[PDB]
Structure 1
Amino acid sequence: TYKFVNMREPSMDMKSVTDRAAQTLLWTELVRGLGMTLSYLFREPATINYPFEKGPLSPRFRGEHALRRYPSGEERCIACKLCEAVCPAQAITIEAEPRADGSRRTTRYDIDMTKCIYCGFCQEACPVDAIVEGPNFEFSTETHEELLYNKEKLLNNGDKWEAEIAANIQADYLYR
Structure 2
Amino acid sequence: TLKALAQSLGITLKYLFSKPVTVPYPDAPVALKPRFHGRHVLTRHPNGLEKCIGCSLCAAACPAYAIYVEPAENDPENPVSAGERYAKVYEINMLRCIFCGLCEEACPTGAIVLGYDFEMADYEYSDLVYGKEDMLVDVVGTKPQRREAKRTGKPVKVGYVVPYVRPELEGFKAPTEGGK
In 2 relative to 1, CA 169–46 (structure 1 residues): closer, same or farther, beyond 3 Å?
same
Could you tell me which residue of structure 1 aligns to residue 138 of structure 2?
Answer: 159
Deviation string 1:91-143 (CA, Å, 9 cap, x unpaired) is 11212123332723121111110111223111111111111121122233232
CA RMSD of aligned residues (A): 2.5
Which protein has the larger Cα radius of gyration, Structure 1 or Structure 2? 1
**Separation in 1, partners of 2:116, 2:108:** 20
- Which of 5, 17, 29 in structure 2 is aligned with 1:54? 29
Identical aligned residues as a percent: 43
Structure 2: 5+ residue stretches without partners = 141-160, 171-180
Could you tell me which residue of structure 2 aligns to residue 68 of structure 1?
Answer: 43
The answer to which structure, 1 or 2, has the higher relative contact order (CA under 8 A, 6+ apart) is: 2
- C-alpha deviation, 1:90, in angstroms: 1.0
- Which of 102, 122, 136 in structure 2 is aligned with 1:121? 102
Deviation string 1:27-67 (CA, Å, 9 cap, x unpaired) is 32222222232122122211212112122111111101121
In 2 relative to 1, CA 79–144 (structure 1 residues): closer, same or farther, beyond 3 Å?
same
Name whichever structure is richer in helix by fraction: 1
SS of 1:169's partner is coil
Q: Given that residues 59 and 171 in structure 1 are in contact (C-alpha distance below 8 angstroms), is that contact kept between their aligned partners in structure 2?
A: no
Matched, 1:99 2:80: no
SS of 1:39's partner is helix
Which amino acid letter does the alignment assign opposite residue 57 of structure 1?
A: L
- C-alpha deviation, 1:171, in angstroms: 8.2
**Separation in 2, partners of 1:108, 1:46:** 46
Q: TM-score, normalised by structure 2?
A: 0.69
Q: Given that residues 95 and 106 in structure 1 are in contact (C-alpha distance below 8 angstroms), is that contact kept between their aligned partners in structure 2?
A: yes
Q: TM-score, normalised by structure 1?
A: 0.70
Q: Given that residues 109 and 151 in structure 1 are in contact (C-alpha distance below 8 angstroms), is that contact kept between their aligned partners in structure 2?
A: yes
Matched, 1:89 2:87: no
**Separation in 1, partners of 2:17, 2:133:** 53
Could you tell me which residue of structure 2 aligns to residue 32 of structure 1?
Answer: 7
Q: Given that residues 93 and 109 in structure 1 are in contact (C-alpha distance below 8 angstroms), is that contact kept between their aligned partners in structure 2?
A: yes
Q: Given that residues 83 and 126 in structure 1 are in contact (C-alpha distance below 8 angstroms), is that contact kept between their aligned partners in structure 2?
A: yes
Which amino acid letter does the alignment assign opposite residue 168 of structure 1?
A: R
The alignment of Structure 1 onto Structure 2 pairs a total of residues equal to 142
- C-alpha deviation, 1:170, in angstroms: 5.1
